[PDB]
């Protein structure tokens, strides 16, 4: 006799802290191997610790100015780094070593991803555009000129084909990958601090800086549902779909706070507390319950928290 569970609520606790960083954690990401978390810092370093024990791995080094985002490729052996140097850098994370310098961008870099084929880089930067790049040659295939102010996120879909940027100027777009041309734009005009697709490539997740998360059918541009309780009105914090056990939203917040919603009827079921100062990055593991959290430069921290679903 099988059945299904529910569960009310999660039972996140803290198992581990990893100190290291020496200034402002940006962002932290598990691998999709689900071997290691790797971090990025305002020190402008990358770390790698296990995913499963905190334990320290290894530091890499070669930015000359703080890091925002790091991201893995597919088969876990590429990191992919922003910087305020106004490059991206490609990592061979076994050697620790920078295989490429991805220049083109005119001021910070603030965001990154690769897309799950791990051929091409997506970056959105202050000086207002996204690029993509090929991972082989290093070198830019399109510039777009996507916003009329920082761009705060890139996410790809599962297929490649499209891109989700968000940007201060309080648009969310839809890019075409091939082609670089927009598909679609969502519109008050809040500045948006983040967004990505869901799990199953029909909502993007997008943050606001009015202390709002919202999830969006974007073929409809409607408003499936809202988050709301957590305090974000500066930082662009990360936000997760939670997709090991429960169905959770995962965030960080302006309190110092973890905050995990119910995805569907969006009652907090869980509020995570540890962090001395604003929690600006969460990451959610690919197959256990298993959140890493990041904090700001009062902390400096990042925290390992393991749930029973
Ligand atoms: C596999 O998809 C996952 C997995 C974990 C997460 Br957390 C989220 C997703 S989803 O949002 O992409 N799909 C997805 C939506 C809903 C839903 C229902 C009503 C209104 C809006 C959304 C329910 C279950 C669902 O599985």
Same mark, same amino acid.
């Given at each position: ?39 990025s810092?305002?020190?402008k370093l990358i770390? +790698? ?9 290894? @530091?890499?080094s070669g930015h000359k100015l703080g890091i925002? #985002?790091?991201?893995? =490729? ?7 780094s922003a910087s305020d140097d106004?490059t991206?850098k ?8 920078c295989?490429? *310098? ?5 001021? !910070? ?38 916003? =009329? #102010? ?23 777009? +839809? ?19 983040? %967004? ?7 909502? &993007?997740?997008?943050? @606001?800086? /009015? $202390? ?13 549902? *809202? !988050? @709301?309780?957590?305090? $974000?009105?500066? !930082? ?6 939670? %997709? ?11 309190? $110092?706070?973890?905050? &995990? ?6 009652? +907090? ?7 001395? /100062?604003?929690? &600006?990055? @969460? ?18 921290? +990042? ?7």
């Open positions: 006799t099988q059945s299904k569970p529910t569960p009310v609520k999660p039972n996140y606790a803290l198992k581990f802290t990893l100190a290291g960083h020496t200034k402002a954690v940006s962002s932290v990401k598990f691998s999709p191997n689900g071997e290691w978390l790797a971090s810092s305002a020190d770390k +790698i610790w296990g995913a499963y024990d905190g334990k320290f791995e290894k @530091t890499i925002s #985002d790091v991201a893995w =490729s597919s088969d876990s052996n590429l990191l992919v106004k991206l490609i990592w061979d994370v076994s050697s620790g070593k295989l490429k *310098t991805l220049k083109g961008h005119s001021n !910070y870099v603030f965001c990154c991803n690769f897309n799950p084929q791990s051929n091409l880089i997506v970056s959105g930067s202050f000086d207002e555009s996204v690029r993509i790049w090929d991972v082989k040659t290093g070198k830019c295939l399109k510039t777009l000129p996507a916003h =009329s #102010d920082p761009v705060s996120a890139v996410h790809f879909n599962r297929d490649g084909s499209l891109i989700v940027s968000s940007s201060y100027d309080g648009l969310c777009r +839809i890019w075409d990958t091939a082609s670089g041309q927009c598909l679609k734009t969502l519109i008050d005009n809040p500045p948006v601090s983040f %967004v990505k697709f869901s799990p199953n490539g029909k909502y &993007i997740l997008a943050a @606001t800086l /009015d $202390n709002t998360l919202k999830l969006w059918d974007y073929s409809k541009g409607k408003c499936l549902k *809202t !988050y @709301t309780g957590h305090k $974000n009105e500066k !930082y662009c914090i990360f936000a997760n779909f939670s %997709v090991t056990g429960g169905k959770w939203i995962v965030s960080g917040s302006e309190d $110092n706070l973890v905050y &995990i919603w119910n995805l569907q009827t969006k009652e +907090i079921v869980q509020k995570l507390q540890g962090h001395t /100062d604003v929690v &600006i990055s @969460t990451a959610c593991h690919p197959t256990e319950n298993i959140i890493a959290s990041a904090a700001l430069e009062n902390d400096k921290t +990042i925290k390992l928290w393991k749930s029973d679903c």
